[PDB]
Amino acid sequence: SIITKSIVNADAEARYLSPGELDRIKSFVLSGQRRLRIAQILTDNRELIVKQGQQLFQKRPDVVSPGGNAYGEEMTATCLRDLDYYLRLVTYGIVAGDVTPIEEIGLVGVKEMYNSLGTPISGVAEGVRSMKNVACSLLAGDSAEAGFYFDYTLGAMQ
Amino acid sequence: SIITKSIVNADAEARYLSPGELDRIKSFVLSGQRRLRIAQILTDNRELIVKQGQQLFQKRPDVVSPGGNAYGEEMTATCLRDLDYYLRLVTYGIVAGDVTPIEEIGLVGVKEMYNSLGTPISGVAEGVRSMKNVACSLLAGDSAEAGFYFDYTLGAMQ
Amino acid sequence: SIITKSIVNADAEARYLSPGELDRIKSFVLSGQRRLRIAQILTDNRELIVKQGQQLFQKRPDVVSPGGNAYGEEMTATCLRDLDYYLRLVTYGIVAGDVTPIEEIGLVGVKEMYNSLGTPISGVAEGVRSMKNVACSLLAGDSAEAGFYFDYTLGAMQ
Amino acid sequence: MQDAITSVINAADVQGRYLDDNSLDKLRGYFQTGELRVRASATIAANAATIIKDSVAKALLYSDITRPGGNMYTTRRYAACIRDLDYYLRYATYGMLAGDPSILDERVLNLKETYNSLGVPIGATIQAVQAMKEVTSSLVGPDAGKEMGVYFDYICSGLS
Amino acid sequence: MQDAITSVINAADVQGRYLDDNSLDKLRGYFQTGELRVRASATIAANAATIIKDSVAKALLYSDITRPGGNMYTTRRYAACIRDLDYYLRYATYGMLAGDPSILDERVLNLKETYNSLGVPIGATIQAVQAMKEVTSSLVGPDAGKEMGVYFDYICSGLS
Amino acid sequence: MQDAITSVINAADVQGRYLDDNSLDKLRGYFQTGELRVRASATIAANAATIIKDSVAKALLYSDITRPGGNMYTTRRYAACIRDLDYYLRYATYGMLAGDPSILDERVLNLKETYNSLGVPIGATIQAVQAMKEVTSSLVGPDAGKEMGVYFDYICSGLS
Ligand SMILES: *[C@H](C)[C@H]1/C(=C/c2[nH]c(/C=C3N=C(/C=C4\NC(=O)C(CC)=C4C)C(C)=C\3CCC(=O)O)c(CCC(=O)O)c2C)NC(=O)[C@@H]1C
Ligand SMILES: *[C@H](C)[C@H]1/C(=C/c2[nH]c(/C=C3N=C(/C=C4\NC(=O)C(CC)=C4C)C(C)=C\3CCC(=O)O)c(CCC(=O)O)c2C)NC(=O)[C@@H]1C
Ligand SMILES: *[C@H](C)[C@H]1/C(=C/c2[nH]c(/C=C3N=C(/C=C4\NC(=O)C(CC)=C4C)C(C)=C\3CCC(=O)O)c(CCC(=O)O)c2C)NC(=O)[C@@H]1C
Ligand SMILES: CCC1=C(C)/C(=C/C2=NC(=C\c3[nH]c(/C=C4\NC(=O)[C@H](C)[C@H]4CC)c(C)c3CCC(=O)O)/C(CCC(=O)O)=C2C)NC1=O
Ligand SMILES: CCC1=C(C)/C(=C/C2=NC(=C\c3[nH]c(/C=C4\NC(=O)[C@H](C)[C@H]4CC)c(C)c3CCC(=O)O)/C(CCC(=O)O)=C2C)NC1=O
Ligand SMILES: CCC1=C(C)/C(=C/C2=NC(=C\c3[nH]c(/C=C4\NC(=O)[C@H](C)[C@H]4CC)c(C)c3CCC(=O)O)/C(CCC(=O)O)=C2C)NC1=O
Ligand SMILES: [Cl-]
Ligand SMILES: [Cl-]
Ligand SMILES: [Cl-]
Ligand SMILES: [Cl-]
Ligand SMILES: [Cl-]
Ligand SMILES: [Cl-]
Ligand SMILES: [Cl-]
Ligand SMILES: [Cl-]
Ligand SMILES: [Cl-]
Ligand SMILES: [Cl-]
Ligand SMILES: [Cl-]
Ligand SMILES: [Cl-]
Ligand SMILES: [Cl-]
Ligand SMILES: [Cl-]
Ligand SMILES: [Cl-]
Ligand code: NA
Ligand code: NA
Ligand code: NA
Ligand code: NA
Ligand code: NA
Ligand code: NA
Ligand code: NA
Ligand code: NA
Ligand code: NA
Ligand code: NA
Ligand code: NA
Ligand code: NA
Ligand code: NA
Ligand code: NA
Ligand code: NA
Ligand code: NA
Ligand code: NA
Ligand code: NA
Ligand code: NA
Ligand code: NA
Ligand code: NA
Ligand code: NA
Ligand code: NA
Ligand code: NA
Ligand code: NA
Ligand code: NA
Ligand code: NA
Ligand code: NA
Ligand code: NA
Ligand code: NA
Ligand code: NA
Ligand code: NA
Ligand code: NA
Ligand code: NA
Ligand code: NA
Ligand code: NA
Ligand code: NA
Ligand code: NA
Ligand code: NA
Ligand code: NA
Ligand code: NA
Ligand code: NA
Ligand code: NA
Ligand code: NA
Ligand code: NA
Ligand code: NA
Ligand code: NA
Ligand code: NA
Numbered sequence: 001s002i003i004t005k006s007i008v009n010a011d012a013e014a015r016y017l018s019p020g021e022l023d024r025i026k027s028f029v030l031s032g033q034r035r036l037r038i039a040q041i042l043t044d045n046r047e048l049i050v051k052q053g054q055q056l057f058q059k060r061p062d063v064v065s066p067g068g069n070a071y072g073e074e075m076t077a078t079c080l081r082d083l084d085y086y087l088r089l090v091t092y093g094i095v096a097g098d099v100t101p102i103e104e105i106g107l108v109g110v111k112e113m114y115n116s117l118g119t120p121i122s123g124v125a126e127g128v129r130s131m132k133n134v135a136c137s138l139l140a141g142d143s144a145e146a147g148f149y150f151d152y153t154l155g156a157m158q
Numbered sequence: 159s160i161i162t163k164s165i166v167n168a169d170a171e172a173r174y175l176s177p178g179e180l181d182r183i184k185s186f187v188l189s190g191q192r193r194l195r196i197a198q199i200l201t202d203n204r205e206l207i208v209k210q211g212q213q214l215f216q217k218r219p220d221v222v223s224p225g226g227n228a229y230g231e232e233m234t235a236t237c238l239r240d241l242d243y244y245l246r247l248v249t250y251g252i253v254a255g256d257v258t259p260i261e262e263i264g265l266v267g268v269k270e271m272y273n274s275l276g277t278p279i280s281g282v283a284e285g286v287r288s289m290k291n292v293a294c295s296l297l298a299g300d301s302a303e304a305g306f307y308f309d310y311t312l313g314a315m316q
Numbered sequence: 317s318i319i320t321k322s323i324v325n326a327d328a329e330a331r332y333l334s335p336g337e338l339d340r341i342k343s344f345v346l347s348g349q350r351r352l353r354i355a356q357i358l359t360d361n362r363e364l365i366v367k368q369g370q371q372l373f374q375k376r377p378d379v380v381s382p383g384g385n386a387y388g389e390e391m392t393a394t395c396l397r398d399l400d401y402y403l404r405l406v407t408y409g410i411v412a413g414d415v416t417p418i419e420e421i422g423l424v425g426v427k428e429m430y431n432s433l434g435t436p437i438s439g440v441a442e443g444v445r446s447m448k449n450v451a452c453s454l455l456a457g458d459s460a461e462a463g464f465y466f467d468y469t470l471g472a473m474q
Numbered sequence: 475m476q477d478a479i480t481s482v483i484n485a486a487d488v489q490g491r492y493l494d495d496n497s498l499d500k501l502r503g504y505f506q507t508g509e510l511r512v513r514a515s516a517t518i519a520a521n522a523a524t525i526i527k528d529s530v531a532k533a534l535l536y537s538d539i540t541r542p543g544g545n546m547y548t549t550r551r552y553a554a555c556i557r558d559l560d561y562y563l564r565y566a567t568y569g570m571l572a573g574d575p576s577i578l579d580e581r582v583l584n585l586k587e588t589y590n591s592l593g594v595p596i597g598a599t600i601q602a603v604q605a606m607k608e609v610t611s612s613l614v615g616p617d618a619g620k621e622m623g624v625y626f627d628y629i630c631s632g633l634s
Numbered sequence: 635m636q637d638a639i640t641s642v643i644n645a646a647d648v649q650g651r652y653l654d655d656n657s658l659d660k661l662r663g664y665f666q667t668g669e670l671r672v673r674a675s676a677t678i679a680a681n682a683a684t685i686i687k688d689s690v691a692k693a694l695l696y697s698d699i700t701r702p703g704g705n706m707y708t709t710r711r712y713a714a715c716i717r718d719l720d721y722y723l724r725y726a727t728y729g730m731l732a733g734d735p736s737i738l739d740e741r742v743l744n745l746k747e748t749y750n751s752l753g754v755p756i757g758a759t760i761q762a763v764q765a766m767k768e769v770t771s772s773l774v775g776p777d778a779g780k781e782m783g784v785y786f787d788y789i790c791s792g793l794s
Numbered sequence: 795m796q797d798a799i800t801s802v803i804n805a806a807d808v809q810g811r812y813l814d815d816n817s818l819d820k821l822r823g824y825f826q827t828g829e830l831r832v833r834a835s836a837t838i839a840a841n842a843a844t845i846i847k848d849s850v851a852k853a854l855l856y857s858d859i860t861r862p863g864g865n866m867y868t869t870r871r872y873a874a875c876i877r878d879l880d881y882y883l884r885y886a887t888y889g890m891l892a893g894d895p896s897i898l899d900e901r902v903l904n905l906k907e908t909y910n911s912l913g914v915p916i917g918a919t920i921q922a923v924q925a926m927k928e929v930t931s932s933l934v935g936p937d938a939g940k941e942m943g944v945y946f947d948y949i950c951s952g953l954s
Contacts, residue, residue: 029508109713187828267553345668425873
């Protein structure tokens with residue numbers, strides 16, 4: 001959240017919120033309604049976003065093939081479940097104003113996780129990216145915000 | 159106190175009092191009687207010292223005037239009360255051999271105090287200084303010691 | 317012990333024993349039998365080793381003479397008791413593969429000890445050295461290991 | 475460190491659910507009080523000094539607390555006391571702008587045993603912070619003054 | 635930090651005795667299990683990753699523990715959990731090669747109150763380390779697998 | 795950290811009073827014992843080594859305490875023990891010269907639970923410090939020897 005982030009940045013220097021940071025928070029609260037709108041639009045079409053998955057596989061068939069991390073319908077399914085997770089994280093981030101909830105919930109130490117699991121990270125990046133192509137298709141340029149959210153996800157993954 | 163000060167200075171280096179520091183303490187204990195004499199002489203004439211206040215006001219009428227920190231007889235009185243405090247601190251210091259009791263009791267963070275209160279610090283310095291003109295008038299050169307005590311006060315204040 | 321030493325060296329870097337350190341430990345365990353043999357040979361002839369003491373005194377008569385730290389048969393005896401201590405430490409070290417038990421048990425702060433006691437450290441070094449001449453006489457070149465053990469003792473003492 | 479929004483999020487994360495109409499409602503409410511919070515934080519930020527002044531002279535000065543035998547009697551203990559009130563006010567402004575008091579439980583509260591073990595009285599401290607509540611209130615308003623009220627009171631319940 | 639050998643030594647130091655036939659016997663035994671310990675430590679060192687994998691998927695994955703409301707549900711808590719199992723395994727390899735479990739009581743155990751105070755469950759942790767026992771065992775053998783067994787179990791008794 | 799003089803001062807500060815005839819009297823007394831304290835501190839400073847020697851050989855050496863199974867048996871525990879006695883003596887000289895035992899309660903005492911938790915026995919420590927009392931006494935005199943006596947005893951009461 002932009003609010004918690006400026007709070008921690010200020011407290012780190014034992015100071016009050018500067019008028020600039022306050023103005024930023026004002027722009028945020030004034031963007032609240034459009035923000036929630038985007039959030040609920042994404043939530044509504046989440047199953048479509050994650051399913052259309054298909055683009056990832058079509059672009060990275062290795063992950064679902066023998067030897068790949070998502071070989072089989074059960075592992076494929078689990079991989080779809082992760083994409084759902086990250087999309088939800090994207091909706092949180094949208095509502096919050098920054099990437100705090102995404103980082104806290106599913107980027108601090110992801111590389112460790114998937115390294116243990118044997119999941120190719122670039123594959124995840126491609127899945128969430130495709131999720132941003134579909135998602136961007138669901139939104140009419142509003143698309144920016146969610147855009148940089150996804151982008152921060154597939155960037156932060158690797 | 160010279161005694162506690164050399165103790166802490168020595169312990170800071172995990173060593174015994176050096177023969178020089180010991181000799182200093184000897185000069186102190188041998189000055190004990192004259193020291194106590196000065197202390198009780200000041201204590202005896204304390205009300206005179208603080209009252210003759212008057213010199214401060216005459217030199218800094220702004221503090222007692224409208225807008226000044228000591229406007230009114232009640233605030234004037236309180237300001238006289240502070241001067242009493244600092245004179246007492248001076249007697250402690252005299253007895254002790256250094257400025258430890260003065261620092262510990264009424265210089266660590268004074269600027270913070272008076273800044274909150276809105277008291278001009280230079281004004282305090284002038285009050286205790288005048289207190290050293292009167293005080294010096296009460297003592298016949300003995301006057302040195304108390305002299306540097308006051309001086310350390312009005313210096314340390316700002 | 318070589319085993320505890322490589323363990324602590326590895327853990328200090330949060331890593332597993334390297335194949336080289338493992339190979340070292342292998343050479344140690346394979347030297348186990350000869351090692352124990354040397355240990356029990358020394359233990360068997362310990363009284364001889366410490367008694368033949370005599371060489372030290374003959375080389376450092378000052379320690380047993382008036383004013384010396386081992387003047388008198390009781391202090392001489394105590395000094396023989398220390399030599400026994402250090403020989404035992406040597407047998408521990410032999411069995412262990414390094415100098416850990418010797419350091420831990422009777423070199424960490426020895427100089428402090430003997431400084432309080434007034435014992436000349438070089439004298440101790442000479443006692444354990446002589447203990448290595450006799451000891452070396454009891455072993456047929458096997459003598460190396462115990463050799464560097466003693467040597468590490470009389471070196472580490474000062 | 476969470477707040478109204480992040481509190482709603484985390485409320486919708488441990489259950490593994492997307493934000494439902496309820497989350498959107500609470501978020502809506504905070505978004506409705508946001509401008510108020512921002513302004514109040516600006517005003518307090520501008521007048522922190524005068525507020526701690528009016529609080530100290532309000533509940534502390536000219537009593538035993540400040541005289542010999544007192545806990546804020548020496549100049550070093552005076553600076554420590556006004557420093558504590560400054561902290562309390564700044565974190566009250568924080569929590570206020572945020573919308574949730576956890577930051578207090580996390581960065582100022584986790585203090586009662588310390589004050590007890592060093593002699594710092596709690597009563598005059600409660601009265602002091604409350605004085606900050608009345609001063610801040612009268613200087614900002616009833617809405618922003620009550621919103622600070624909930625957090626100041628929170629600190630009171632934490633110390634007591 | 636001691637081991638079989640140094641444990642025998644210290645057993646022969648506090649009494650002020652040279653090593654007797656008993657010390658020579660125990661030392662003999664350790665010298666007889668040494669090569670085994672060395673090899674097992676090599677094999678575990680080579681396959682630590684795959685072992686922690688088989689342990690996590692074995693007792694942890696696809697349950698509540700990993701889902702929302704779970705203790706290893708977020709990615710940061712997942713990395714912390716697999717990091718704990720990595721530590722446990724590495725000190726199990728240590729103690730194994732050494733021949734005595736004191737290193738565990740000295741550098742990993744002195745943790746139960748911490749897990750309790752931060753919510754880390756002990757049950758799933760016991761089941762996890764035990765899973766490491768079965769994986770390591772089946773991958774190294776029955777002798778080396780039981781020798782790790784005693785130390786893994788030791789950690790279980792330390793946490794529980 | 796206070797002493798006779800600063801103790802009198804602080805006794806005259808928390809009440810907000812100038813120094814009265816009583817303060818002047820106590821200060822007088824300390825000023826009367828000052829030269830004694832200074833000299834004694836010089837003599838102890840000159841002979842600290844020999845004093846710790848005579849204390850250790852006095853109460854410690856040639857018993858269990860120093861033999862295997864003993865608390866000062868190894869050379870590292872021997873250096874730690876004589877280091878403790880050196881500290882105790884130096885702070886006894888401090889407090890002695892000062893005239894008040896608070897420095898002990900502030901920089902050496904706040905130790906019993908530590909010794910208990912690490913096995914350091916208190917009995918042989920009390921006997922050791924007392925030995926320092928008798929050695930120092932016989933080497934400085936009855937007056938200076940009793941003035942050290944009060945502080946050594948103070949430490950004994952602190953450990954016990
Ligand atoms: C899909 C695009 C890629 C892929 C994924 C894959 N994931 C797993 C298993 C797990 N993934 C997680 C992920 C998360 N946990 C979290 O808390 C968060 C943040 C909210 C994330 C992203 C977890 C915990 C597991 C394991 C247990 C469980 O899910 O409940 C697998 C399973 C692999 C296996 O052998 O078990 C796969 C296959 N696979 C690909 O190839 C794509 C690149
Ligand atoms: C007088 C020369 C100047 C001046 C002083 C002034 N002081 C105050 C109020 C207080 N001053 C203190 C001071 C001390 N407390 C200590 O413990 C020590 C060390 C021993 C000192 C020096 C304190 C605690 C107060 C406030 C409460 C109380 O005194 O009990 C005031 C009051 C201002 C007001 O509005 O209340 C004034 C006016 N004023 C000047 O202009 C001079 C330069
Ligand atoms: C002999 C070669 C030299 C010598 C020695 C000497 N030693 C002492 C007294 C003590 N020595 C020790 C030594 C150890 N304690 C340990 O734990 C270890 C490691 C295992 C060692 C080496 C101790 C504790 C004492 C004092 C009490 C006691 O032994 O029980 C003395 C006694 C001196 C005296 O006045 O008491 C002497 C004379 N003396 C020499 O001149 C040689 C160079
Ligand atoms: C935000 C996080 C945070 C807080 C709030 C905090 C409080 C805090 N107050 C302290 C002391 C103190 N606090 C006071 C407070 C008071 N005295 C009075 O009479 C008043 C009634 C009252 C204040 C309203 C005083 C006098 C001391 C000093 C005690 C001493 O050490 O001498 C100390 C001991 C350290 C020191 O100041 O020397 C801490 C650590 N610390 C923190 O990290
Ligand atoms: C070797 C010496 C040593 C050990 C062993 C150790 C453990 C340890 N585990 C911790 C936390 C944790 N430990 C776990 C562990 C688990 N979660 C699960 O669901 C699993 C069942 C289980 C592991 C098998 C988790 C999730 C946390 C993080 C709790 C939190 O801070 O959020 C923490 C708190 C610090 C942190 O990680 O943020 C320590 C200090 N520390 C040490 O110094
Ligand atoms: C001045 C402030 C101050 C004091 C006094 C002090 C004492 C102190 N003594 C200690 C240990 C010890 N203290 C002794 C003392 C004794 N053994 C004996 O047999 C004697 C009877 C007795 C001394 C007369 C021993 C053997 C240890 C070491 C225990 C161990 O760690 O192995 C330790 C643990 C740290 C270490 O030495 O390794 C402290 C911290 N620490 C301080 O900061
Ligand atoms: Cl912060
Ligand atoms: Cl960021
Ligand atoms: Cl110090
Ligand atoms: Cl100074
Ligand atoms: Cl280590
Ligand atoms: Cl070494
Ligand atoms: Cl929903
Ligand atoms: Cl302070
Ligand atoms: Cl602080
Ligand atoms: Cl034997
Ligand atoms: Cl963490
Ligand atoms: Cl850690
Ligand atoms: Cl008086
Ligand atoms: Cl130690
Ligand atoms: Cl220490
Ligand atoms: Na600060
Ligand atoms: Na700024
Ligand atoms: Na589709
Ligand atoms: Na598939
Ligand atoms: Na990759
Ligand atoms: Na030291
Ligand atoms: Na000097
Ligand atoms: Na006058
Ligand atoms: Na006036
Ligand atoms: Na000024
Ligand atoms: Na690490
Ligand atoms: Na290596
Ligand atoms: Na012989
Ligand atoms: Na002799
Ligand atoms: Na020497
Ligand atoms: Na949270
Ligand atoms: Na879920
Ligand atoms: Na619902
Ligand atoms: Na809700
Ligand atoms: Na709900
Ligand atoms: Na608003
Ligand atoms: Na404003
Ligand atoms: Na009043
Ligand atoms: Na609110
Ligand atoms: Na504390
Ligand atoms: Na209470
Ligand atoms: Na030991
Ligand atoms: Na013995
Ligand atoms: Na036997
Ligand atoms: Na045995
Ligand atoms: Na035996
Ligand atoms: Na073997
Ligand atoms: Na291998
Ligand atoms: Na399952
Ligand atoms: Na074994
Ligand atoms: Na902890
Ligand atoms: Na339990
Ligand atoms: Na004091
Ligand atoms: Na007063
Ligand atoms: Na009186
Ligand atoms: Na008195
Ligand atoms: Na009186
Ligand atoms: Na005297
Ligand atoms: Na002398
Ligand atoms: Na004896
Ligand atoms: Na006295
Ligand atoms: Na401790
Ligand atoms: Na007891």
